[PDB]
Amino acid sequence: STECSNLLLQYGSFCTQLKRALTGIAVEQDKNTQEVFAQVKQIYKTPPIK
Amino acid sequence: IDRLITGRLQSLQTYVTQQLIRAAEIRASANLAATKMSECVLGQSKRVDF
């Protein structure tokens, strides 16, 4: 709706900081996964003998 | 004036809540730094990757 968008533009920058907060959370989740799992430099392999 | 007061109060409450969350994160980092100063500088640590 164009009229709702025109009235929503009057409220300032609530949506920009909401989007910034959600982007920060979404980056932080991948940072969590990388700093938990990727603690090894090379991908090791077991020998064929079990 | 009532409309402007409500808008400015909402924005200032959002700022205070974000500052409280950032203060919790900074306090966690400062607790980790205090632990590192107590255990790495003041002694020798047997903890791996610490």
From Swiss-Prot, chain B:
Name under which the protein is recorded: Spike protein S2'
Its biological purpose: Subunit of the fusion protein that is processed upon entry into the host cell. Mediates fusion of the virion and cellular membranes by functioning as a class I viral fusion protein. Contains a viral fusion peptide that is unmasked after S2 cleavage. This cleavage can occur at the cell membrane by host TMPRSS2 or during endocytosis by host CSTL. In either case, this triggers an extensive and irreversible conformational change that leads to fusion of the viral envelope with the cellular cytoplasmic membrane, releasing viral genomic RNA into the host cell cytoplasm.
Domain of life: Viruses
